[PDB]
Paper text:
RecQ proteins are ATP- and DNA-dependent super family 2 (SF2) helicases and separate double stranded DNA (dsDNA) in a 3′ to 5′ direction. Remarkably, RecQ4 entirely lacks the RQC domain, yet its helicase activity is required for various DNA protective functions. Here we present the crystal structure of the human RecQ4 helicase, encompassing its central ATPase domain and a large fraction of its unique C-terminus. Downstream of the ATPase core, we identify a novel domain, which features homology to WH domains of various prokaryotic DNA-binding proteins and coordinates a Zn2+-ion, yet lacks structural resemblance to the conserved RQC domain.
The RecQ4427-1116 model was refined to a resolution of 2.75 Å and contains aa 449–1111. Two disordered regions within the C-terminus (aa 858–882 and aa 975–983) and two short areas within the ATPase domain (aa 664–667 and aa 727–734) are not resolved. Two ‘bridging’ α-helices (aa 823–835 and aa 1046–1079) link HD2 to a unique domain further downstream (aa 836–1045), which is not present in other RecQ helicases. Zn2+-coordination is accomplished via three cysteines and a histidine, which are located in the loop region between helix α12 and β-strand β13. The two bridging helices thus connect the HD2 to the R4ZBD in a hinge-like fashion, with the joint of the hinge being located at the HD2–bridge–helix interface. The R4ZBD, on the other side of this lever, interacts with HD1 through several salt bridges and hydrogen bonds. The R4ZBD of RecQ4 is located directly adjacent to HD1 and thus assumes a unique position among the characterized RecQ proteins, as their C-terminal extensions are located on the opposite side, directly adjacent to HD2. Our structural alignment between RecQ4 and other known RecQ structures revealed that RecQ4s bridging helix α11, the downstream part of bridging helix α19 and helix α20, together, mimic the conserved structure and exact position of the RQC-Zn2+-binding domain of other RecQ helicases, with the notable difference that RecQ4 does not coordinate a zinc ion at this position. In agreement with our ARL data, the RecQ4 structure exhibits a highly electropositive cleft between the R4ZBD and HD1, poised to bind the negatively charged ssDNA backbone. Our in vitro biochemical analysis of the RecQ4427–1116 variant provides evidence that our model features all necessary structural elements for ATP- and DNA-dependent helicase activity.
Author numbering: 449 to 663, 668 to 726, 735 to 857, 883 to 974, 984 to 1111
């Protein structure tokens, strides 16, 4: 357990910022605190959770780097930074003193990667660990907090994903905070987000147990325009050659599909072929390997590449000052996504120009709507999922393998079940993220009892060289194997069925089964290998739910979950309509009128619309 670095003064007020923090701040490279950074850093150094909403992505890294540096100087500890896979996909390396490491899904070394990082942690050669959310609550997960150094605090990047009001709600973020509190000892969180309304930011503060406090107006030097050209490719060439854009040398163009980035980049390179030396345009999307993305971003940072054509999803994790223009080929899916992308231009006070090309026949809004309706879960899927999660048990009425008679009725104390992910996805026609979402909906509800224990392998297969006689000979070493061989009038079975029927823990069953690779020589001990093969498979949700629900109670559960599915859909549709209405209300038929100078009345009117959207509760 890590004690707070700084202690509160009398009456509970924050202690005055010491000299040490400033020294550390200079050491990292930044020579000044951005607004709200000094207070937030002092909060974490005192053990107080805090939410920080930043207008631009710049300065987000310093908020966890300075406390991690100071927490690690006092006593060997570890700071967890949770951020999406895109953030760690390309081996990002920060300041050297921290000695950071990343464990993510993309790491294709399996336990070797995680253990090498674990072994590096054990050698104190790691003080900041960056985990994608899926790695923290996935199959591999993290070792117990006892094996790990004590955690000073956890930084939650993209904290808006916790709230059902944000543009990008991800239920696994609810699981992350739960595991960090229960499995780990983390009760001091730093929430970092760059895009959130007052309704979303206040909801995140509820989840992180942060006191509410005011903490993104679009800058005055950004000049916005919107048009509905007939041919977007032709219009893009016409706009970039106009006087408003022809002398801007740092442009980002956001596209919907990544096949489009390579086409637009190749188009600009051929139609603008000509001080004199520098590269015109390069595509930047997630399909490219890690090397080519690093080079493209490096070239853009060094002013050697004029245009980067990227997808909205990959976007630009890089922050560069004096970015001159941001263009959108297609309606953005939300105000948050637009302001984030546009907020990258004009970091210096110098003027920056942004133009959005709406699809003339409205096909971009129709595609976004088609996606929302496709992500909706059918009611039959919700009904079939509830039946699989709350199946009837024999506690209140043979059916049980080890009962010859029903026996006296009992009050159901819950059962542990394995919901196989791949099997349920193909049987119910719903993706894994939707199943996870509905399970998270049920756990949060107070009246409905469900526990999402873990995501792990629950199926076990045992192949024997000696056939059936060799497997029977090992029944004295493994009580789980003993009850299986009796039930059977290569063997595989469900390990969570064993858990519930014999009262064991899933780990205890897993240990005893893999102990089947050792045998004791009759003379002495000299444990030697049995040669049996033990393989775990069928990744599943490990649940704990009652088995005594009536049909009426299951129906009420379905109405709850389906109501949440429809309300999430009505919210996503309402966000699309409100987003299109704003850009259209300010749009021209072509980019001709804004080839020379933007319309200040129109640019100001749009910037005021966005401002009132985020200042709303
Ligand atoms: Zn029961």
């Amino acid at each position: 357990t890590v004690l707070p670095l700084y202690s509160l003064g009398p009456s509970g007020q924050l202690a005055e910022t010491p000299a040490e923090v400033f020294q550390a701040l200079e050491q990292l490279g930044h020579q000044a605190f951005r607004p709200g950074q000094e207070r937030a850093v002092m909060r974490i150094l005192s053990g107080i959770s805090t939410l920080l909403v930043l207008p631009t992505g710049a300065g987000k890294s310093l908020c966890y780097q300075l406390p991690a540096l100071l927490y690690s100087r006092r006593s060997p500890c570890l700071t967890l930074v949770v951020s999406p896979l895109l953030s760690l996909m390309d081996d990002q390396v920060s300041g050297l003193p921290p000695c950071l490491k990343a464990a993510c899904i993309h790491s294709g070394m399996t336990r070797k990667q995680r253990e090498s990082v674990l072994q590096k942690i054990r050698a104190a050669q790691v003080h900041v660990l960056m985990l994608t959310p899926e790695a923290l609550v996935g199959a591999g997960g993290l070792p117990p907090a006892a094996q790990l150094p004590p955690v000073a605090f956890a930084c939650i990047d993209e904290a808006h994903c916790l709230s059902q009001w944000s543009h990008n709600f991800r239920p696994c973020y609810l699981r992350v905070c739960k595991v960090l509190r229960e499995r780990m000892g983390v009760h001091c969180f730093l929430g970092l987000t760059a895009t959130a309304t007052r309704r979303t930011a206040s909801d995140v503060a509820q989840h992180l147990a942060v006191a509410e406090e005011p903490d993104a107006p679009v800058p005055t030097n950004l000049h916005l325009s919107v048009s509905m050209d007939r041919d977007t490719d032709q219009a893009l060439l016409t706009l970039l050659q106009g006087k408003r854009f022809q002398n801007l040398d740092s442009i980002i163009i956001y596209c919907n599909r990544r096949e489009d980035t390579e086409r637009i980049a190749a188009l600009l390179r051929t139609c603008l072929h000509a001080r004199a030396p520098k590269t015109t345009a390069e595509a930047y999307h997630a399909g490219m390997c890690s090397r080519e993305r690093r080079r493209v971003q490096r070239a853009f940072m060094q002013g050697q590449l004029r245009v980067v054509v990227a997808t909205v999803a990959f976007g630009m994790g890089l922050d560069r000052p004096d970015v001159r223009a941001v263009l959108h080929l297609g309606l953005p899916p939300s105000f948050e996504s637009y302001v984030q992308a546009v907020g990258r231009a004009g970091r210096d006070g110098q003027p920056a120009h942004c133009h959005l090309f709406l699809q003339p026949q409205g096909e971009d809004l129709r595609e976004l709507r088609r996606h929302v309706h496709a992500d909706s879960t059918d009611f039959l899927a919700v009904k079939r999922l509830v039946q699989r999660v709350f199946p009837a048990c024999t506690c209140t009425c043979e059916q049980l393998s080890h009962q010859a008679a029903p026996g006296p009725r009992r009050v159901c104390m819950g059962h542990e079940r394995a919901l196989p992910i791949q099997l349920t996805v193909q049987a119910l026609d719903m993706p894994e993220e939707a199943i996870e979402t509905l399970l998270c909906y049920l756990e949060l509800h107070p009246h409905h009892w469900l526990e999402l224990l873990a995501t792990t392998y629950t199926h076990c297969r045992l192949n024997c060289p000696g056939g059936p006689a060799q497997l029977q000979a090992l029944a004295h070493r493994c009580p789980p194997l003993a009850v299986c061989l009796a039930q059977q009038l290569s063997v595989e079975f469900d390990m969570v069925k064993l858990v519930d029927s014999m009262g064991w823990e899933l780990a205890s069953v897993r240990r005893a089964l893999c102990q089947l690779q050792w045998d004791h020589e009759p003379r002495t001990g000299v444990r030697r290998g049995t040669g049996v093969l033990v393989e775990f498979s069928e990744l599943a949700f490990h649940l704990r739910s009652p088995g005594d629900l009536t049909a009426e109670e299951k129906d009420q559960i379905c109405d709850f979950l389906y109501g949440r599915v429809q309300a999430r859909e009505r919210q996503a549709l309402a966000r699309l309509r409100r987003t299109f209405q704003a850009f259209h209300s300010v749009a021209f038929p072509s980019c001709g009128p804004c080839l020379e100078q933007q319309d200040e009345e129109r640019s100001t009117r749009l910037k005021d619309l966005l401002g009132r959207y985020f200042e709303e509760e």
